[PDB]
């Protein structure tokens, strides 16, 4: 786990040399031949660069806006092809925000319906 | 209020067979390739499971189309849900959820798509719906209804006329609030309550520890260390000793993967049951005996938990 | 609404036809079973070309090249490799088959409870309230068409747990008391259709002093006009 | 009878509706 150096009497921890799987993140080739490459579980210093928990993503731009997940990367991150168009990375949304108008004397009752 | 705990997912492990068997060895790799595509077959088997672990999580927790927020006014007719609702001052998890979480070589571990924060967000939506829109949000759109009115339907559903709830509404709310405090104390200092989740974690850890420890075995070879063989024997003899280690280590990986596939099959089934329970116990009221614990089922609330889901059955 | 319901149903059937039509992704679940089995078979056969430590993966080359004292050793190397490949294959098939075993049990359960009757189980027969379903034949599996009731437009109503009449508390036999802001009605929860609140709709139990949120209204007795006439 | 059935809608909107007499147990009592 660690070694005490023979001359300095200092202790240094031993980590493995960075490694991990290499994944290609792509839209279907039917609409785009643009790709991004994710180096899983590694630092960007070892390998439009985004460092995340799942690894180093090179090629896609990162944005502030969340979107429903399209093609997942992991650890809260998904990617998509958006406006001209390019591959982007974002924190995934789990759906649109909503609420219930919970007044303590209010009820909603359907007046029409459909059969699906 | 009783607690039922089910596992949902396993650690998304991944194994590099080259690093495991022939790490940093050209001569070993050349011999490993003589055994065909066993690595491809084993790698696909483990990759497939890692994918299924997110499928299991998705089926159990992602049961809403919108994320519903709780009301600004926590007035539910005397019913106190402050221990199961997320705490906004924190990861926005409930008091009970924090208590639950606090009690649980060439190889790597991949992250889940949905981290504890995302699971907590789904859980929040499920409770906000259950409490303020009944089961309508499960069937379709979330339609508001007063909590007491919702309970009146839940009681009628078990053969108890609606007037009983109202005559005893104060008593029922008090019994409920007490029951929530009781589960907090039960889950609290004693970790045995979550043994079912702990067992999944422990079994996976043991499988991994066994696989790594096997690298030190000779399997009939003069040495378990590949580098000692390579620096000691000329190829006509070194290759034989290497094959002995390849066979042993490859058999160990095959055993490991098979064991993971079988354990994963159990989890597959548990996740299906957990998802069924949420749909029929939380997003509606089943009339199934012993499905949502003992007694006649009225309502339930999910809670986020490490590697699984915890259901509170009322 | 029989005319409307029949029209919505007929439209819904056309919609599933178009969804299933040109796009094969809809049936990926059946395609995956076929593909996984094909891959398992292709892998098993390809492994026959592997040496597994032998001088040659071809049994005939060993037999025509080496005398038995050496040929037998090279053959054992291929037997061990090929036998291990079969053992791996069979184990993999048994595990995959176990998944299919479970899926078939679920599919059979669904037909019995979704097609041969109507279950009241949430998310069992798709989303919405289950009415009926129809099975369809499919390659290596079964396709279920689930017909469900889903609420659409909704309206904002005021409610109450009970009506206070003569000091007595009136509760619905079935349904919810609602108000349009001027008048109280009683209706079924899953389809707004307001009725006049009468003694034939409600029942009396308890009183006005014990019901939280009780409101003042008039409960109609269909018998009194008859006694007076 | 009126104690078995309920009234909702009318005779012009029900497909397959038939002509019969619905009995009211109250009328004989009012007359007696
Ligand atoms: C809901 O229950 C919680 C306890 O589980 C209540 O929190 C306590 O409130 C009292 C004041 O009435 C404080 O003195 C305690 O210190 C609080 N306990 C904790 C752990 O914070 C909460 O007030 C109840 N809310 C309602 C509306 O009843
Ligand atoms: C609320 O419901 C009441 C009762 O049906 C409505 O009052 C009726 O309105 C019609 C149309 O003007 C009149 O012909 C009836 O004579 C009224 N009935 C009574 C008892 O007064 C009322 O208009 C509805 N209000 C809203 C906003 O829908
Ligand atoms: C329904 O109306 C009656 C009056 O006819 C209400 O009874 C009065 O309630 C007030 C308190 O708000 C008391 O001070 C009066 O003494 C009560 N009058 C009588 C004769 O008892 C009754 O509270 C109303 N109920 C509702 C739900 O509105
Ligand atoms: C029930 O009987 C009445 C007659 O008492 C029917 O009403 C007539 O229907 C015919 C068409 O078949 C019309 O041409 C007449 O003008 C209607 N008479 C009246 C007074 O409206 C009614 O259609 C019958 N309903 C059923 C289901 O048999
Ligand atoms: C070794 O010698 C160097 C000087 O050349 C000195 O700075 C260092 O502290 C010494 N280390 C030990 C363990 O004595
Ligand atoms: C795929 O390509 C075809 C043309 O070959 C095009 O008509 C179709 O719209 C494309 N699919 C998508 C999603 O763009
Ligand atoms: C990557 O390396 C830098 C140092 O160059 C370090 O500061 C950073 O925290 C590392 N990030 C990860 C994810 O290891
Ligand atoms: C998000 O917005 C902040 C400013 O509020 C900016 O500093 C940051 O770089 C933005 N991040 C991305 C990915 O655009
Ligand atoms: C329900 O909405 C449809 C349009 O989608 C309309 O044609 C139908 O008449 C409406 N039914 C009712 C009862 O409002
Ligand atoms: C019902 O009315 C309230 C205002 O009184 C509004 O805030 C709420 O959003 C409405 N409900 C729906 C479903 O629109
Ligand atoms: C609703 O809450 C208000 C307080 O804001 C209270 O005065 C009223 O009586 C409550 N009504 C019901 C039905 O709980
Ligand atoms: C049954 O079908 C006949 C046509 O053959 C039609 O005249 C009759 O009105 C239908 N009755 C019902 C209840 O649909």
PDB file of C-alpha atoms in Angstrom, chain C residues 55-209:
ATOM      1  CA  UNK C  55       0.542 -27.642 -31.562  1.00  0.00           C
ATOM      2  CA  UNK C  56      -2.581 -27.508 -33.725  1.00  0.00           C
ATOM      3  CA  UNK C  57      -6.302 -26.944 -33.275  1.00  0.00           C
ATOM      4  CA  UNK C  58      -6.951 -29.511 -35.978  1.00  0.00           C
ATOM      5  CA  UNK C  59      -7.391 -33.019 -34.629  1.00  0.00           C
ATOM      6  CA  UNK C  60      -6.552 -34.605 -37.965  1.00  0.00           C
ATOM      7  CA  UNK C  61      -3.212 -32.771 -38.124  1.00  0.00           C
ATOM      8  CA  UNK C  62      -2.263 -34.171 -34.737  1.00  0.00           C
ATOM      9  CA  UNK C  63      -3.325 -37.713 -35.631  1.00  0.00           C
ATOM     10  CA  UNK C  64      -1.428 -37.788 -38.941  1.00  0.00           C
ATOM     11  CA  UNK C  65       1.684 -36.121 -37.489  1.00  0.00           C
ATOM     12  CA  UNK C  66       2.379 -37.612 -34.087  1.00  0.00           C
ATOM     13  CA  UNK C  67       2.683 -41.187 -32.895  1.00  0.00           C
ATOM     14  CA  UNK C  68       0.221 -42.026 -30.010  1.00  0.00           C
ATOM     15  CA  UNK C  69       2.780 -41.363 -27.129  1.00  0.00           C
ATOM     16  CA  UNK C  70       2.756 -37.702 -28.210  1.00  0.00           C
ATOM     17  CA  UNK C  71      -0.512 -37.472 -30.165  1.00  0.00           C
ATOM     18  CA  UNK C  72      -2.569 -38.368 -27.124  1.00  0.00           C
ATOM     19  CA  UNK C  73      -1.124 -35.445 -25.194  1.00  0.00           C
ATOM     20  CA  UNK C  74      -1.965 -32.943 -27.905  1.00  0.00           C
ATOM     21  CA  UNK C  75      -5.440 -34.440 -28.201  1.00  0.00           C
ATOM     22  CA  UNK C  76      -6.018 -34.143 -24.432  1.00  0.00           C
ATOM     23  CA  UNK C  77      -5.117 -30.461 -24.706  1.00  0.00           C
ATOM     24  CA  UNK C  78      -7.887 -30.010 -27.289  1.00  0.00           C
ATOM     25  CA  UNK C  79     -10.336 -32.166 -25.328  1.00  0.00           C
ATOM     26  CA  UNK C  80      -9.814 -30.111 -22.195  1.00  0.00           C
ATOM     27  CA  UNK C  81     -10.225 -26.835 -24.074  1.00  0.00           C
ATOM     28  CA  UNK C  82     -13.279 -27.932 -26.059  1.00  0.00           C
ATOM     29  CA  UNK C  83     -14.877 -29.644 -23.060  1.00  0.00           C
ATOM     30  CA  UNK C  84     -14.388 -26.503 -20.955  1.00  0.00           C
ATOM     31  CA  UNK C  85     -15.956 -24.497 -23.784  1.00  0.00           C
ATOM     32  CA  UNK C  86     -19.007 -26.800 -23.773  1.00  0.00           C
ATOM     33  CA  UNK C  87     -19.265 -26.634 -19.991  1.00  0.00           C
ATOM     34  CA  UNK C  88     -19.136 -22.831 -20.141  1.00  0.00           C
ATOM     35  CA  UNK C  89     -21.710 -22.785 -22.941  1.00  0.00           C
ATOM     36  CA  UNK C  90     -24.132 -25.083 -21.156  1.00  0.00           C
ATOM     37  CA  UNK C  91     -23.817 -23.145 -17.905  1.00  0.00           C
ATOM     38  CA  UNK C  92     -24.451 -19.896 -19.775  1.00  0.00           C
ATOM     39  CA  UNK C  93     -27.500 -21.439 -21.475  1.00  0.00           C
ATOM     40  CA  UNK C  94     -28.871 -22.695 -18.146  1.00  0.00           C
ATOM     41  CA  UNK C  95     -28.599 -19.232 -16.609  1.00  0.00           C
ATOM     42  CA  UNK C  96     -30.101 -17.460 -19.627  1.00  0.00           C
ATOM     43  CA  UNK C  97     -32.820 -20.107 -19.728  1.00  0.00           C
ATOM     44  CA  UNK C  98     -33.584 -19.376 -16.064  1.00  0.00           C
ATOM     45  CA  UNK C  99     -34.296 -15.759 -17.023  1.00  0.00           C
ATOM     46  CA  UNK C 100     -36.598 -16.952 -19.801  1.00  0.00           C
ATOM     47  CA  UNK C 101     -38.244 -19.380 -17.375  1.00  0.00           C
ATOM     48  CA  UNK C 102     -39.153 -16.396 -15.181  1.00  0.00           C
ATOM     49  CA  UNK C 103     -40.271 -14.265 -18.152  1.00  0.00           C
ATOM     50  CA  UNK C 104     -42.533 -17.046 -19.424  1.00  0.00           C
ATOM     51  CA  UNK C 105     -44.083 -17.344 -15.958  1.00  0.00           C
ATOM     52  CA  UNK C 106     -44.753 -13.621 -15.935  1.00  0.00           C
ATOM     53  CA  UNK C 107     -46.134 -13.689 -19.472  1.00  0.00           C
ATOM     54  CA  UNK C 108     -48.479 -16.531 -18.547  1.00  0.00           C
ATOM     55  CA  UNK C 109     -49.552 -14.674 -15.407  1.00  0.00           C
ATOM     56  CA  UNK C 110     -50.244 -11.592 -17.499  1.00  0.00           C
ATOM     57  CA  UNK C 111     -52.375 -13.462 -19.969  1.00  0.00           C
ATOM     58  CA  UNK C 112     -54.429 -15.077 -17.204  1.00  0.00           C
ATOM     59  CA  UNK C 113     -54.967 -11.883 -15.207  1.00  0.00           C
ATOM     60  CA  UNK C 114     -54.865  -9.205 -18.003  1.00  0.00           C
ATOM     61  CA  UNK C 115     -56.600 -11.061 -20.909  1.00  0.00           C
ATOM     62  CA  UNK C 116     -58.789 -13.717 -19.237  1.00  0.00           C
ATOM     63  CA  UNK C 117     -60.001 -11.193 -16.669  1.00  0.00           C
ATOM     64  CA  UNK C 118     -59.222  -7.682 -15.537  1.00  0.00           C
ATOM     65  CA  UNK C 119     -56.666  -7.167 -12.834  1.00  0.00           C
ATOM     66  CA  UNK C 120     -56.727  -4.059 -10.685  1.00  0.00           C
ATOM     67  CA  UNK C 121     -52.958  -4.144 -10.324  1.00  0.00           C
ATOM     68  CA  UNK C 122     -51.153  -0.863 -10.993  1.00  0.00           C
ATOM     69  CA  UNK C 123     -48.634  -0.880 -13.864  1.00  0.00           C
ATOM     70  CA  UNK C 124     -49.391  -4.563 -14.456  1.00  0.00           C
ATOM     71  CA  UNK C 125     -51.105  -3.999 -17.875  1.00  0.00           C
ATOM     72  CA  UNK C 126     -49.247  -0.807 -18.771  1.00  0.00           C
ATOM     73  CA  UNK C 127     -50.166   2.653 -17.490  1.00  0.00           C
ATOM     74  CA  UNK C 128     -53.687   3.795 -16.568  1.00  0.00           C
ATOM     75  CA  UNK C 129     -56.667   1.865 -15.216  1.00  0.00           C
ATOM     76  CA  UNK C 130     -56.934  -1.544 -16.817  1.00  0.00           C
ATOM     77  CA  UNK C 131     -60.053  -2.446 -18.789  1.00  0.00           C
ATOM     78  CA  UNK C 132     -59.074  -5.190 -21.288  1.00  0.00           C
ATOM     79  CA  UNK C 133     -56.196  -6.602 -23.308  1.00  0.00           C
ATOM     80  CA  UNK C 134     -55.568  -8.732 -26.349  1.00  0.00           C
ATOM     81  CA  UNK C 135     -52.595 -11.094 -26.982  1.00  0.00           C
ATOM     82  CA  UNK C 136     -50.770 -11.261 -30.311  1.00  0.00           C
ATOM     83  CA  UNK C 137     -48.474 -13.998 -31.616  1.00  0.00           C
ATOM     84  CA  UNK C 138     -44.822 -13.044 -31.918  1.00  0.00           C
ATOM     85  CA  UNK C 139     -41.488 -14.691 -32.814  1.00  0.00           C
ATOM     86  CA  UNK C 140     -40.050 -16.448 -29.758  1.00  0.00           C
ATOM     87  CA  UNK C 141     -42.518 -14.628 -27.498  1.00  0.00           C
ATOM     88  CA  UNK C 142     -45.829 -12.912 -26.813  1.00  0.00           C
ATOM     89  CA  UNK C 143     -47.054  -9.391 -27.430  1.00  0.00           C
ATOM     90  CA  UNK C 144     -49.763  -7.894 -25.272  1.00  0.00           C
ATOM     91  CA  UNK C 145     -51.934  -4.982 -26.321  1.00  0.00           C
ATOM     92  CA  UNK C 146     -53.187  -3.238 -23.206  1.00  0.00           C
ATOM     93  CA  UNK C 147     -56.326  -1.128 -23.341  1.00  0.00           C
ATOM     94  CA  UNK C 148     -56.463   1.314 -20.456  1.00  0.00           C
ATOM     95  CA  UNK C 149     -58.515   4.213 -19.121  1.00  0.00           C
ATOM     96  CA  UNK C 150     -56.611   7.441 -18.697  1.00  0.00           C
ATOM     97  CA  UNK C 151     -58.135  10.706 -17.327  1.00  0.00           C
ATOM     98  CA  UNK C 152     -57.704  13.763 -19.541  1.00  0.00           C
ATOM     99  CA  UNK C 153     -59.037  17.231 -18.808  1.00  0.00           C
ATOM    100  CA  UNK C 154     -59.544  17.890 -15.110  1.00  0.00           C
ATOM    101  CA  UNK C 155     -61.428  20.578 -13.281  1.00  0.00           C
ATOM    102  CA  UNK C 156     -60.743  22.477 -10.012  1.00  0.00           C
ATOM    103  CA  UNK C 157     -63.477  21.753  -7.356  1.00  0.00           C
ATOM    104  CA  UNK C 158     -63.954  22.555  -3.679  1.00  0.00           C
ATOM    105  CA  UNK C 159     -64.530  19.537  -1.432  1.00  0.00           C
ATOM    106  CA  UNK C 160     -65.666  18.442   2.026  1.00  0.00           C
ATOM    107  CA  UNK C 161     -65.777  15.114   3.974  1.00  0.00           C
ATOM    108  CA  UNK C 162     -69.421  15.537   4.922  1.00  0.00           C
ATOM    109  CA  UNK C 163     -72.588  17.562   4.712  1.00  0.00           C
ATOM    110  CA  UNK C 164     -74.219  19.006   7.874  1.00  0.00           C
ATOM    111  CA  UNK C 165     -78.018  18.904   7.634  1.00  0.00           C
ATOM    112  CA  UNK C 166     -80.159  18.619  10.812  1.00  0.00           C
ATOM    113  CA  UNK C 167     -77.071  18.439  13.033  1.00  0.00           C
ATOM    114  CA  UNK C 168     -76.522  14.938  11.692  1.00  0.00           C
ATOM    115  CA  UNK C 169     -73.474  14.113   9.545  1.00  0.00           C
ATOM    116  CA  UNK C 170     -74.113  12.855   6.013  1.00  0.00           C
ATOM    117  CA  UNK C 171     -71.313  10.966   4.231  1.00  0.00           C
ATOM    118  CA  UNK C 172     -71.358   9.678   0.584  1.00  0.00           C
ATOM    119  CA  UNK C 173     -72.146   6.009   0.108  1.00  0.00           C
ATOM    120  CA  UNK C 174     -69.583   6.187  -2.693  1.00  0.00           C
ATOM    121  CA  UNK C 175     -67.884   9.260  -4.137  1.00  0.00           C
ATOM    122  CA  UNK C 176     -66.836  12.745  -3.050  1.00  0.00           C
ATOM    123  CA  UNK C 177     -68.741  15.902  -2.165  1.00  0.00           C
ATOM    124  CA  UNK C 178     -67.810  18.720  -4.496  1.00  0.00           C
ATOM    125  CA  UNK C 179     -68.654  22.362  -5.001  1.00  0.00           C
ATOM    126  CA  UNK C 180     -68.668  24.672  -8.040  1.00  0.00           C
ATOM    127  CA  UNK C 181     -68.514  27.731  -5.655  1.00  0.00           C
ATOM    128  CA  UNK C 182     -72.309  28.138  -5.501  1.00  0.00           C
ATOM    129  CA  UNK C 183     -73.752  24.638  -4.982  1.00  0.00           C
ATOM    130  CA  UNK C 184     -72.736  21.262  -3.508  1.00  0.00           C
ATOM    131  CA  UNK C 185     -72.983  18.022  -5.497  1.00  0.00           C
ATOM    132  CA  UNK C 186     -71.833  14.454  -5.002  1.00  0.00           C
ATOM    133  CA  UNK C 187     -69.967  12.536  -7.694  1.00  0.00           C
ATOM    134  CA  UNK C 188     -67.818   9.499  -8.523  1.00  0.00           C
ATOM    135  CA  UNK C 189     -64.070  10.089  -8.202  1.00  0.00           C
ATOM    136  CA  UNK C 190     -62.945   8.825 -11.623  1.00  0.00           C
ATOM    137  CA  UNK C 191     -65.368  10.802 -13.842  1.00  0.00           C
ATOM    138  CA  UNK C 192     -67.021  14.104 -12.963  1.00  0.00           C
ATOM    139  CA  UNK C 193     -70.767  13.797 -13.168  1.00  0.00           C
ATOM    140  CA  UNK C 194     -72.404  15.856 -10.371  1.00  0.00           C
ATOM    141  CA  UNK C 195     -75.512  14.549  -8.648  1.00  0.00           C
ATOM    142  CA  UNK C 196     -77.949  16.227  -6.306  1.00  0.00           C
ATOM    143  CA  UNK C 197     -77.114  15.303  -2.733  1.00  0.00           C
ATOM    144  CA  UNK C 198     -79.964  13.208  -1.393  1.00  0.00           C
ATOM    145  CA  UNK C 199     -80.737  10.717   1.352  1.00  0.00           C
ATOM    146  CA  UNK C 200     -80.410   7.945  -1.251  1.00  0.00           C
ATOM    147  CA  UNK C 201     -76.790   8.850  -1.963  1.00  0.00           C
ATOM    148  CA  UNK C 202     -75.489   9.555   1.530  1.00  0.00           C
ATOM    149  CA  UNK C 203     -75.709   7.811   4.882  1.00  0.00           C
ATOM    150  CA  UNK C 204     -75.873   9.183   8.401  1.00  0.00           C
ATOM    151  CA  UNK C 205     -73.311   8.363  11.043  1.00  0.00           C
ATOM    152  CA  UNK C 206     -72.010  10.647  13.766  1.00  0.00           C
ATOM    153  CA  UNK C 207     -72.773  14.363  13.868  1.00  0.00           C
ATOM    154  CA  UNK C 208     -71.651  17.861  12.758  1.00  0.00           C
ATOM    155  CA  UNK C 209     -69.491  18.462  15.832  1.00  0.00           C
TER     156      UNK C 209
END
